[PDB]
Design an enzyme around this catalytic site. Structure first.
Site, PDB file in Angstrom:
ATOM      1  N   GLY A   1       0.944   5.408   1.492  1.00 44.07           N
ATOM      2  CA  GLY A   1       0.601   6.485   2.317  1.00 44.07           C
ATOM      3  C   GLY A   1       1.051   7.920   2.123  1.00 44.07           C
ATOM      4  O   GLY A   1       2.015   7.806   1.215  1.00 44.07           O
TER       5      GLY A   1
ATOM      6  N   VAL B   1       4.831   0.880   0.916  1.00 41.95           N
ATOM      7  CA  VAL B   1       5.403  -0.452   1.319  1.00 41.95           C
ATOM      8  C   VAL B   1       5.177  -1.271   0.261  1.00 41.95           C
ATOM      9  O   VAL B   1       4.139  -1.574  -0.036  1.00 41.95           O
ATOM     10  CB  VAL B   1       4.646  -0.884   2.653  1.00 41.95           C
ATOM     11  CG1 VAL B   1       5.279  -1.876   3.140  1.00 41.95           C
ATOM     12  CG2 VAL B   1       4.676   0.148   3.695  1.00 41.95           C
TER      13      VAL B   1
ATOM     14  N   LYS C   1       9.661  -0.415   3.397  1.00 39.94           N
ATOM     15  CA  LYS C   1       8.998   0.979   3.194  1.00 39.94           C
ATOM     16  C   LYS C   1      10.051   1.976   2.429  1.00 39.94           C
ATOM     17  O   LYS C   1      11.101   2.200   2.848  1.00 39.94           O
ATOM     18  CB  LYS C   1       9.075   1.330   4.446  1.00 39.94           C
ATOM     19  CG  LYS C   1       8.035   2.603   4.593  1.00 39.94           C
ATOM     20  CD  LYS C   1       7.150   3.047   5.752  1.00 39.94           C
ATOM     21  CE  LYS C   1       7.976   3.563   6.925  1.00 39.94           C
ATOM     22  NZ  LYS C   1       7.549   3.992   8.128  1.00 39.94           N
TER      23      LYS C   1
ATOM     24  N   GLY D   1       0.771  -1.215  -0.030  1.00 41.14           N
ATOM     25  CA  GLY D   1      -0.105  -0.125   0.034  1.00 41.14           C
ATOM     26  C   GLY D   1       1.033   1.242  -0.219  1.00 41.14           C
ATOM     27  O   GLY D   1       2.179   1.195  -0.025  1.00 41.14           O
TER      28      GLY D   1
ATOM     29  N   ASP E   1       0.772   9.117  16.230  1.00 41.21           N
ATOM     30  CA  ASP E   1      -0.123   8.877  14.880  1.00 41.21           C
ATOM     31  C   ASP E   1      -0.708   7.426  14.921  1.00 41.21           C
ATOM     32  O   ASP E   1      -0.554   6.629  13.963  1.00 41.21           O
ATOM     33  CB  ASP E   1       0.711   9.194  13.811  1.00 41.21           C
ATOM     34  CG  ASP E   1       0.128   9.197  12.332  1.00 41.21           C
ATOM     35  OD1 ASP E   1      -1.134   9.613  12.405  1.00 41.21           O
ATOM     36  OD2 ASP E   1       0.705   8.828  11.193  1.00 41.21           O
TER      37      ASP E   1
ATOM     38  N   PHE F   1       3.756   9.182   3.093  1.00 43.64           N
ATOM     39  CA  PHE F   1       5.354   8.908   3.276  1.00 43.64           C
ATOM     40  C   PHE F   1       5.839   8.221   2.123  1.00 43.64           C
ATOM     41  O   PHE F   1       7.113   8.185   1.918  1.00 43.64           O
ATOM     42  CB  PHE F   1       5.566   7.859   4.512  1.00 43.64           C
ATOM     43  CG  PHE F   1       4.897   6.755   4.366  1.00 43.64           C
ATOM     44  CD1 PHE F   1       5.548   5.667   3.335  1.00 43.64           C
ATOM     45  CD2 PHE F   1       3.788   6.305   5.075  1.00 43.64           C
ATOM     46  CE1 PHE F   1       5.049   4.467   3.634  1.00 43.64           C
ATOM     47  CE2 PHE F   1       3.268   5.193   5.031  1.00 43.64           C
ATOM     48  CZ  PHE F   1       3.790   4.343   4.100  1.00 43.64           C
TER      49      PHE F   1
HETATM   50  C1  LIG Z   1       3.778   2.758   7.803  1.00 45.42           C
HETATM   51  N1  LIG Z   1       4.590   1.559   8.029  1.00 45.42           N
HETATM   52  C2  LIG Z   1       4.145   0.402   7.444  1.00 45.42           C
HETATM   53  C3  LIG Z   1       4.916  -0.479   7.934  1.00 45.42           C
HETATM   54  C4  LIG Z   1       5.065  -1.891   7.861  1.00 45.42           C
HETATM   55  C5  LIG Z   1       6.120  -2.781   8.162  1.00 45.42           C
HETATM   56  C6  LIG Z   1       5.951  -4.035   7.964  1.00 45.42           C
HETATM   57  C7  LIG Z   1       5.048  -4.778   7.040  1.00 45.42           C
HETATM   58  O1  LIG Z   1       4.648  -5.734   6.834  1.00 45.42           O
HETATM   59  C8  LIG Z   1       3.334  -5.538   6.013  1.00 45.42           C
HETATM   60  C9  LIG Z   1       3.011  -4.316   5.830  1.00 45.42           C
HETATM   61  C10 LIG Z   1       1.891  -3.744   4.974  1.00 45.42           C
HETATM   62  C11 LIG Z   1       0.624  -4.315   4.747  1.00 45.42           C
HETATM   63  N2  LIG Z   1      -0.115  -3.378   4.399  1.00 45.42           N
HETATM   64  N3  LIG Z   1       0.546  -2.274   4.338  1.00 45.42           N
HETATM   65  C12 LIG Z   1       0.111  -1.038   3.483  1.00 45.42           C
HETATM   66  C13 LIG Z   1       0.598   0.260   4.559  1.00 45.42           C
HETATM   67  C14 LIG Z   1       0.035   0.080   5.942  1.00 45.42           C
HETATM   68  C15 LIG Z   1       0.232   1.374   6.539  1.00 45.42           C
HETATM   69  C16 LIG Z   1       0.352   2.495   6.089  1.00 45.42           C
HETATM   70  C17 LIG Z   1       0.659   2.664   4.596  1.00 45.42           C
HETATM   71  C18 LIG Z   1       0.747   1.461   3.928  1.00 45.42           C
HETATM   72  C19 LIG Z   1       1.878  -2.366   4.639  1.00 45.42           C
HETATM   73  C20 LIG Z   1       3.976  -3.665   6.497  1.00 45.42           C
HETATM   74  N4  LIG Z   1       4.014  -2.346   6.775  1.00 45.42           N
HETATM   75  C21 LIG Z   1       5.995   0.422   8.461  1.00 45.42           C
HETATM   76  N5  LIG Z   1       5.757   1.565   8.709  1.00 45.42           N
END
Ligand SMILES: Cn1cc(-c2ccc3occ(-c4cnn(Cc5ccccc5)c4)c3n2)cn1
Length: 335
Positions: free
Chosen positions: A25, A30, A46, A23, A143, A27
């Site tokens: 965001g 990922v 990320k 996905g 957040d 920022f």
């Molecule tokens: C902000 N952030 C995410 C991680 C993070 C770390 C480990 C991860 O293993 C899987 C995911 C994952 C699954 N859906 N998404 C979309 C998403 C989620 C949250 C925000 C944006 C996109 C990611 C993931 N993400 C560390 N910071």
């Protein structure tokens, strides 16, 4: 642009092969990768936008995760594990253990059907445990929102539901971890004026009264409501309207908080109940307990906890250490 470097098949740091986008965001994105130097293990990477605000947050996050991961090497307190970080075509990339779906995406992709109360209880307990660990270590997340709460595993079943004609996911185990430490702030650090995503933002933040760990508790109460209803009780993008919605759901704000706000630019809120916005707030919002979907005692217990988390006064507000002892969590402990 990031799209030039985040495509399936791209190899990062001579080892990580992109297989999917998980996905986006504000920022960046990922992506899920195969780590060819760790026996083919899948990881999450990320990819951070090459913009100062986000680069700065990523560098901060790296330092916070180093601290949290070293302090809690088993992830007993459910903060995501960072594996390493690197730079790729000028973008900071942080590599994590691969988790499952965000709780946001899971509910969204189910047409906003609420989580089961038994799952909410387990999730809430783990979120409180995790974030309390931050609070024990002079940190505030700032957040917290459903997008930053991820399922540990992909432990759900999926099928094409005949009724809706779309696919539904059904949770088998609801275990979570907390992610995104790019806004996390130590007690002795500069505190940003504006923190949190609006719908999760505490009144002391809105009123520029100073914030600390209690603002996370407020955000968690908002998250739990969303899990229970499938939507926010604060459907607004305006600070004054947000305060009016609080007043309608929770009652009037304390005098001491009004009188401190030296930015008393909002004040009794100065609010016309009879205006378009006023009519909207009266329709959309009602006292908290009226959103309960059942009068069963487990629902009452959840709502009692939420009410305490949505206490206006950040001093009086329940702490997470106290929340873990609340009656709502008794079902978890009835051996
Ligand atoms: C902000 N952030 C995410 C991680 C993070 C770390 C480990 C991860 O293993 C899987 C995911 C994952 C699954 N859906 N998404 C979309 C998403 C989620 C949250 C925000 C944006 C996109 C990611 C993931 N993400 C560390 N910071």
């Amino acid at each position: 642009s990031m799209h030039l470097i985040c495509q399936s098949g791209d190899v990062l740091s001579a080892r990580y092969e992109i297989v999917d986008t998980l996905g986006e965001g504000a920022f960046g994105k990922v992506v899920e990768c195969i780590d060819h130097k760790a026996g083919g293990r899948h990881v999450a990477v990320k990819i951070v936008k090459n913009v100062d605000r986000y680069c700065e947050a990523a560098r901060s996050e790296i330092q916070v995760l180093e601290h949290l991961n070293t302090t809690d090497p088993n992830s007993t307190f459910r903060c995501v594990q960072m594996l390493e970080w690197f730079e790729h075509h000028g973008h900071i990339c942080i590599v994590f253990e691969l988790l499952g779906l965000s709780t946001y995406d899971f509910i969204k992709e189910n047409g906003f059907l609420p989580f089961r109360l038994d799952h909410i209880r387990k999730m809430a307990y783990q979120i409180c445990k995790s974030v309390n660990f931050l609070h024990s270590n002079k940190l505030t997340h700032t957040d917290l929102k459903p997008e930053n709460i991820l399922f540990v595993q992909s432990d759900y079943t999926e099928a094409y539901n005949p009724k809706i004609k779309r696919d539904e996911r059904t949770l088998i185990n609801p275990d979570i971890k907390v992610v995104d430490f790019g806004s996390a702030t130590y007690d002795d650090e500069h505190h940003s004026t504006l923190v949190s995503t609006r719908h999760y933002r505490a009144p002391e933040v809105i009123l520029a009264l100073g914030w600390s760990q209690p603002c996370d508790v407020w955000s968690i109460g908002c998250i739990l409501i969303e899990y229970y209803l499938g939507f926010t009780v604060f459907p607004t993008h305006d600070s004054k309207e947000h305060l009016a919605m609080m007043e309608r759901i929770l009652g009037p704000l304390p005098k001491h908080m009004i009188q401190k706000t030296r930015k008393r630019k909002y004040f009794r809120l100065d609010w016309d109940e009879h205006s378009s916005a006023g009519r909207y707030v009266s329709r959309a919002c009602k006292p908290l307990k009226e959103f309960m979907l059942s009068q069963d005692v487990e629902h009452e217990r959840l709502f009692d906890l939420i009410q305490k988390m949505l206490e206006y006064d950040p001093a009086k507000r329940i702490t997470l250490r106290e929340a873990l002892k609340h009656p709502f969590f008794d079902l978890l402990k009835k051996s």
